[PDB]
């Protein structure tokens, strides 16, 4: 078989999320659920309830905490070829959080970098959310889209998200900024010899 | 009470020939069916097979047939999922999984998958073991220090021994097109505290044995 399921699903805290595989002749298979949250192995699992359309299984989460949050992965079994299938994943995203802006921090190199002949920028960000950005370096107002190295956001202690981008370059190019963009909101740096 | 607890992380280089092992105690081992599903970086699980304790049978997936065998042990309750010739895509986390959920009926005879092993992180790379280049970051004030070209990512940085601990912010590391890691670590300080005190980075990677401290000045 294969197992169609919704890439992402966000629920506001004290509501009911539903998470809807999708796959054909699911009569008299039953659909197993399993919830993992982010860097732990899965768990198989009175709020979580779950349900078979005989075309479509859909788990319920009635009453929403955080402590839900984590990628749903259904799946079943072809008795036919004896194949384990599993679903795309969902991840679900619990909105207790507001929106709040990155802050930026651009550090030159530390000289030393030079004498072992080499230039590297870094632009750090932090304490952003929601959780993407679209970063973009320019060398005196034009654009570089050149030896750029982005992260993954990436998520804090704190609860917001945090990323870095290096610049690789050489001294050469180094005395002859940093644009982070979130939400349309633009914040830029500085850079001088 | 039931667990299966699996083998500790490995980072290889391709080529080489990967075994996990996960041990079953708090039930009869040879009860019940046990599969192997992986996860890729960042993405959803995909089944490997299943392997039976007691007969020793074994069904591999369609995409996973050849290339990967599974194993029984019996006289210490543990089973074996072996890449005899891993390659840089088989870079992920391998979990084993016992099927002890019972089933409804006779339409669908599936026992579920409910105890799970805590994982394994396997890291296949050609890259080989650098220790880290620290170079001091020039500046409330921000400090900090960015060590470049290390592997594996598995390093630490602390702050005048242990000293820091308030405004440190240590960033995750990237992986760059080289297979190489990189990560900065920052401090925030009132605009006025360069002169008071000098501030040390410690930077410890274990894989390399390298230990480097790093004065911190404008």
């Known amino acids: 078989s294969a197992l169609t399921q919704p890439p992402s699903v966000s629920v506001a805290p004290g509501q009911t999320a539903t998470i809807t595989c999708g796959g054909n002749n699911i009569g008299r298979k039953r659909v197993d659920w399993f919830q993992q949250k982010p860097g732990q192995a899965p768990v198989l699992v009175e709020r979580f309830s779950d349900s078979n359309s005989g075309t479509t299984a859909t788990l319920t989460i009635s009453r929403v905490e955080a402590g839900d949050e984590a990628d749903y992965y259904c799946?079943?079994?072809?008795?036919?070829?004896?194949?384990?299938?599993f679903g795309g994943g969902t991840k679900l995203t619990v909105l207790g959080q507001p929106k709040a802006a990155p802050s930026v921090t651009l550090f030159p190199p530390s000289s030393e970098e030079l004498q072992a002949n080499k230039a590297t920028l870094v632009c750090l960000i932090s304490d952003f959310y929601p959780g993407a950005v679209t970063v973009a370096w320019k060398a005196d107002s034009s654009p570089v889209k050149a030896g750029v190295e982005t992260t993954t956001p990436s998520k804090q202690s704190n609860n917001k998200y945090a990323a870095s981008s290096y610049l690789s370059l050489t001294p050469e190019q180094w005395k002859s900024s940093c644009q982070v963009t979130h939400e349309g909101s633009t914040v830029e740096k500085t850079v001088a010899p | 009470q039931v667990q299966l607890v699996q083998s500790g992380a490995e980072v290889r280089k391709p080529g080489a020939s990967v075994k996990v092992s996960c041990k079953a105690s708090?039930?009869?081992?040879?009860?019940?069916?046990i599969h192997w599903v992986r996860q890729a970086p960042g993405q959803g699980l995909e089944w490997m097979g299943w392997i039976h304790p007691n007969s020793g049978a074994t069904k591999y997936a369609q995409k996973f047939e050849g290339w990967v065998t599974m194993t029984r042990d019996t006289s210490i309750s543990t089973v074996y999922m072996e890449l005899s010739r891993s390659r840089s895509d088989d870079t992920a986390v391998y979990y084993c999984?016992?099927?002890?959920?019972?089933?409804?009926?006779?339409?669908?005879?599936?026992?579920?998958?409910?105890?799970w092993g805590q994982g394994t992180a396997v890291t296949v790379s050609s890259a080989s073991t650098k220790g880290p280049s620290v170079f001091p970051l020039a500046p409330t004030a921000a400090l900090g220090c960015l060590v470049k070209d290390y592997f594996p990512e598995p390093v630490t940085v602390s702050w005048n021994s242990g000293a820091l601990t308030s405004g440190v912010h240590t960033f995750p590391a990237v992986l760059q097109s080289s297979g190489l890691y990189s990560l900065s670590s920052v401090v925030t300080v009132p605009s006025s505290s360069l002169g008071t005190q000098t501030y040390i980075c410690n930077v410890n990677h274990k894989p390399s044995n390298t230990k480097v401290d790093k004065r911190v000045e404008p």
């Open positions: 799946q079943v079994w072809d008795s036919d070829s004896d194949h384990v299938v």
């Open positions: 999984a016992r099927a002890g959920l019972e089933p409804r009926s006779v339409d669908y005879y599936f026992y579920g998958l409910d105890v």
């Open positions: 708090g039930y009869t081992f040879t009860d019940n069916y």
